[PDB]
């Protein structure tokens, strides 16, 4: 009976709510009320990257925290150098409309996905000396929103068909699909242990997955609009979400609940890209009002405004060593702050 | 700098020069976005105008190389990837004139004409589409001409009170689409009634696009 199944689902949701309330005794504010203030974090544009003819939609760093890849809407995937302004590579993309980009942790591959519905893997290291296509991952029936590299052979990809899938490169098929979302999946973040990843989607719900088992362990809902960004805490046991409701939320995995809301009355514009600092104390969110707001993660007090862009900040990238925050916006520039 | 760094700087300068040349080549090419409801004539427009992912139609007219993008595939809520097409010069909208008396199969209460009306209302008043002009194509002109005698338009529009003639009904549909433009100051809507056989549709798009280019040039100069 469909009514019986619906009643069982409602009862189980009530049980989950009861358990969540029981496990919650003191909010994060009470413990962090006695913690020291983070101070006024001020940043300057150390390096401005120019050469994109359209709006930058994605940007990822490398393992060395020296190189950088940027995806615009003119079909160009320029591999930059943040140390010295230098275009290492320029991949001409068949699918100009690109919404995501990724850099392999080893540094030999990159990826680009957009409304084309394909995660095109590119071979940076080669004997012929030019960057070409590794393979075309065409298994998704929705637009490519985000993709991240598990390894040189495994890539986790999120799409607009409310599903995500782990790919195996040497075969080019979906090793394990992830299903259970009812809205456009926007962003994913592989955890440091390369076992779990959170997929915030457009149904105001972010779902944790384990890559190996392939089934959803935890579901989080505290939002009211589409979650447009996600980023694991560097510890890997927490993660932040940025949504169109102009609020950022931090969730803890063990307690399975929202902890802090990063909301201000002056903010009406919804977040697009969210990234953490190296220690996780600092939460950088690329807001929709042409600015990047810097939030203390433990204490919900804003501590900086990386206002240097004339258009919407779409991608945010923090270096692995935490020495630079690349902010790529729609004014066709990337800015490195430190 | 060292010799390797000097070579790196030379390589970066070459890549920048090639990107600049790519920008030179794409100056005259112009980016249109095709939208419309189901079976509203989108395929007819593409087939005329040449002669999953999103489809791209490339076609030339007096040094204007138009790239039209169709996102009929990859169906989503459309509030999530529309910001890609903010920089497009023109939205070629397709609306079915013959859809006034034919309702949606999924929901007969939802008239397809009303669905096209609502989706145009969404497009013409949208966050990223305030400035983009719209070229309006009323397709199925022959079918609508045949159906104007058959079915009274009042069954579709409660406000319909005019005679059931091809002309007056056509202009009434035209206004029902145009006066959705609340801010009829910056964006301009060019309305054309195509008959699924007209050969000047690409010709219409040519001068509509040149007009939009001139309008944007005046706006950038401030003379407009």
């Amino acid at each position: 009976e469909l009514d019986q199944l619906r009643q069982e689902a409602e009862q189980l949701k009530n049980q989950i709510r009861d358990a969540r309330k029981a496990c919650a005794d003191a909010t994060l504010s009470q413990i962090t009320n006695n913690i020291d203030p983070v101070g006024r974090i001020q940043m300057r544009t150390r390096r401005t990257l120019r050469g994109h003819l359209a709006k930058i939609y994605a940007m990822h760093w490398g393992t060395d925290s020296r190189l950088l890849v940027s995806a615009s809407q003119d079909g160009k995937l320029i591999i930059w150098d943040s140390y010295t302004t230098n275009k290492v590579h320029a991949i001409p993309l068949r699918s100009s409309w690109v919404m995501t980009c990724a850099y392999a942790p080893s540094g030999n591959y990159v990826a680009c996905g957009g409304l084309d519905n394909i995660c095109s893997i590119y071979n940076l290291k080669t004997r012929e000396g030019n960057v070409r296509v590794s393979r075309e991952l065409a298994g998704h029936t929705g637009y490519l929103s985000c993709c991240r590299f598990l390894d040189d052979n495994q890539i986790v990809t999120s799409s607009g068909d409310t599903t995500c899938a782990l790919w195996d490169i040497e075969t080019g098929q979906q090793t394990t699909t992830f299903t259970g979302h009812t809205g456009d999946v926007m962003s994913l973040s592989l955890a440091p242990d390369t076992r779990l990843f959170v997929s915030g989607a457009c149904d105001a719900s972010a779902k944790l997955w384990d890559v190996r088992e392939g089934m959803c362990r935890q579901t989080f809902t505290g939002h009211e609009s589409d979650i447009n960004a996600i980023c694991f805490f560097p510890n890997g046991n927490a993660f932040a979400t940025g949504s169109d409701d102009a609020t950022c939320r931090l969730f803890d995995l063990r307690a399975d609940q929202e902890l802090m809301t990063y909301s201000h009355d002056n903010i009406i514009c919804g977040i697009t890209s969210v990234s953490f600092s190296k220690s996780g104390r600092l939460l950088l969110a690329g807001y929709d009002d042409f600015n990047c707001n810097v939030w203390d993660a433990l204490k919900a007090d804003r501590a900086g405004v990386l206002a240097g862009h004339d258009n919407r900040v779409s991608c945010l990238g923090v270096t692995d060593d935490g020495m630079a925050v690349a902010t790529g916006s729609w004014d066709s520039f990337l800015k490195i702050w430190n | 700098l060292s010799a390797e760094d000097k070579a790196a700087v030379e390589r970066s300068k070459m890549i920048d020069r090639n990107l600049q040349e790519d920008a030179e080549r794409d100056a005259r090419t112009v980016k249109l976005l095709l939208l419309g409801a189901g079976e509203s004539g989108k395929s007819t427009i593409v087939k005329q105008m040449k002669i999953t992912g999103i489809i791209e139609t490339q076609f030339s007219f007096k040094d204007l190389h138009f790239r039209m993008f169709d996102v009929g595939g990859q169906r989503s809520e459309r509030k999530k990837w529309i910001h890609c097409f903010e920089g497009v010069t023109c939205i070629i909208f397709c609306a079915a004139l013959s859809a006034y008396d034919m309702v949606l199969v999924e929901d007969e209460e939802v008239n397809r004409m009303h669905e096209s009306l609502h989706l145009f209302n969404s497009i013409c008043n949208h966050k990223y589409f305030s400035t983009t002009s719209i070229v309006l194509f009323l397709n199925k002109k022959d079918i609508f001409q045949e159906k104007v005698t058959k079915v009274h338009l009042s069954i579709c529009f409660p406000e319909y009170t005019g005679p059931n003639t091809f002309e007056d009904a056509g202009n009434y549909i035209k206004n029902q689409f145009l006066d959705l433009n609340l801010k009829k100051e910056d964006k301009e809507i060019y309305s054309h009634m195509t008959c699924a056989t007209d050969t000047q549709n690409v010709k219409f798009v040519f001068d509509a696009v040149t007009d939009i280019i001139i309008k944007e040039n005046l706006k950038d100069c401030g003379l407009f």
Partner: single-chain antibody
Amino acid sequence: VQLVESGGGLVQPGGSRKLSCSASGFAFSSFGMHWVRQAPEKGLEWVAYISSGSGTIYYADTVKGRFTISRDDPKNTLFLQMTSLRSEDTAMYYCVRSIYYYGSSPFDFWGQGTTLTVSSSDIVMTQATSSVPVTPGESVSISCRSSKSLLHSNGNTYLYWFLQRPGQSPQLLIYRMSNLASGVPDRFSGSGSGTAFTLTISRLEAEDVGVYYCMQHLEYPLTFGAGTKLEL
């Protein structure tokens, strides 16, 4: 990838010729293309260097003005025009491709080379070790000394190690004095203090037999070493 060359032969002193290197299997228009010589029983000496797009032109002081180097991207061909040739130019000419970034491998590939017969301030780098009797399975290191410290201000040392099998072309072993070139066994490695360098080799095989050279890439008068030989 292949860079088989042509031209050269038996010429009179004070003659004219046009040596050609033909490219295949790689993006020629993006690479930097060098010309490297080799006296009949001596080491190598850098001679000419075209850049991508011919923006940068460099010649050795010995062939300065005398030789001209040019590239042909549409046909993927290198040229080295020579006039007023002298007896010092009897050499095993090579065309060498060097790509243009850090994290990349300059002098990655060497052509087959053509034979030329003639009738009747730069950082010097030396390898005083010269002849080294070696046996398979024994670790042997090759030392190279530089006249100027090779640690640039960018923290990137510039030293390149090559191994020349008998009757073959030099193959890059180590680039930037530490990194291992592609397709090179992991036995090879490099270390040093920035002025004195060693090329440590693990258990030796028939492949390692040959003569090894070291090149600096800091100041563009790229000087190769005398050439340490490993005889088994």
